[PDB]
Design a protein around this nucleic acid. Structure first.
Ligand code: DCP
Ligand code: MG
Ligand code: MG
Ligand code: MG
Length: 341
DNA sequence: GGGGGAAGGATTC
DNA sequence: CACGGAATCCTTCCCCC
């Protein structure tokens, strides 16, 4: 089995550049302003100029300014990015039937039937980097290997604007080398729980008793990491289907007042329901981020579909439930719809 | 024991 | 003492078959 993984480069940032060549050469930071304050918000991404100096995705727009007070800061125009993304996803579909759009800027293609060996898979990759480069002028990184996980890992190692094949031999060596924290699905807390067990490489996972891994990091991550180390990880490439659709917004000020909060709640329902398109949901969840970025929610699943009107009513009861059971104020409020008919 | 719900938890884009 | 907006899969506790 051969998997080809593609991941666009500093995507949102690169897109703004392709739409305005003047930005090229200058550090760029794409951010999402909460509207709270003139510079309240987080960073979606920054190009590699700004990246060099610590400006990474997720940090406050304010932290970024201290560092690069003179970088170019642009508001995120997501509809534009989705547009560019779909056009590139369409070009990829041409190279293989089995394709999985994993996110706004990445995809896994099973090219087992389109190539005979790793050398051929490689040129397919170069063929793909060029197409996108001449059709959209967006550079991307490609990683190639035997399964989805190693295909991703490969692309991270080749970024930016690269291509990298990790063959069966190269895989065995990666199971031995490679910091376990670099494995997809392993974040900071999980990485720490593994350090307390003396686990630094995937291979080390074979040495611990299964129930000691299961007890420490849950059974899922256990099995996942185990088969990975045993070179038995084989998950099919499948087309993904949305399980949920939502919308959350930051209020102008924190609050615990129902009448002050309803308008924000209703806007979020209005916009979520438009995103649903044909879909009719059977479950609804009101989600809130407390004043201390803590997130809480209350939802309800119905015997049948939920019309927009019903969501307005139910959402208010659910919000009142949050207010009743939680004493702190709310900073962000919104909804999530799921269990589509 | 395990399916479906309901709140959290962790990770990732 | 800051601090965005989405999505997804998983784990713990509860009802119920
Ligand atoms: N915390 C994040 C991370 C990503 N994104 C969006 C904008 C990013 O441009 C896009 C792709 O995210 P990646 O980090 O996976 O890819 P990048 O292009 O940002 O970095 P790279 O150079 O690895 O491709 O997803 C976001 O909104 N918030
Ligand atoms: Mg990516
Ligand atoms: Mg990218
Ligand atoms: Mg919490």
């Amino acid at each position: 089995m051969i998997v080809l993984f593609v991941d666009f480069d500093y995507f949102y940032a690169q897109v703004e550049e392709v739409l305005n060549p003047s930005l090229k050469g200058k550090p760029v930071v794409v951010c999402v302003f909460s509207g709270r304050f003139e510079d309240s918000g987080a960073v979606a991404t920054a190009n590699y100029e700004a990246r060099k100096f610590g400006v990474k995705a997720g940090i406050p727009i304010v932290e970024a300014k201290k560092i690069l007070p003179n970088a170019v800061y642009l508001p995120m125009r997501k509809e534009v990015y989705q547009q560019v993304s779909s056009r590139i996803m369409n070009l990829l579909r041409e190279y293989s039937e089995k394709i999985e759009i994993a996110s706004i800027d990445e995809a896994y293609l099973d090219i087992s039937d389109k190539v005979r060996d790793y050398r051929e898979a490689y040129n397919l990759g170069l063929e793909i980097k060029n197409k996108i480069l001449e059709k959209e002028k967006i550079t991307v990184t490609v990683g190639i290997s035997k399964n989805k996980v190693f295909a991703k890992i490969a692309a991270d190692m080749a970024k930016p604007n690269g291509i990298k094949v990790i063959d069966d031999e190269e895989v065995k060596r990666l199971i031995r080398e490679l910091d376990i924290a670099d494995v997809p699905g392993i974040g900071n807390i999980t990485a720490e729980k593994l350090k307390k067990l003396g686990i630094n490489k995937l291979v080390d996972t074979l040495s611990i008793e299964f129930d000691k891994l299961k007890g420490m990091i849950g059974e899922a991550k256990a099995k996942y990491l185990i088969s990975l180390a045993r070179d038995e990880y084989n998950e099919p490439i499948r087309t993904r289907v949305r399980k949920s659709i939502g919308r959350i917004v930051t209020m102008k000020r924190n609050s615990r007042n129902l009448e002050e909060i309803k308008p924000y709640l209703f806007r979020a329902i209005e916009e979520s329901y438009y995103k649903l398109d044909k879909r009719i949901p059977k479950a609804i969840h009101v989600v809130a981020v407390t004043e201390d970025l803590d997130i809480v929610s209350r939802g309800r699943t119905f015997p049948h579909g939920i019309s927009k009107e019903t969501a307005y009513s139910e959402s208010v009861k659910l919000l009142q439930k949050i207010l009743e059971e939680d004493e702190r104020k709310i900073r962000r409020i919104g909804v999530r719809f799921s269990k589509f008919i």
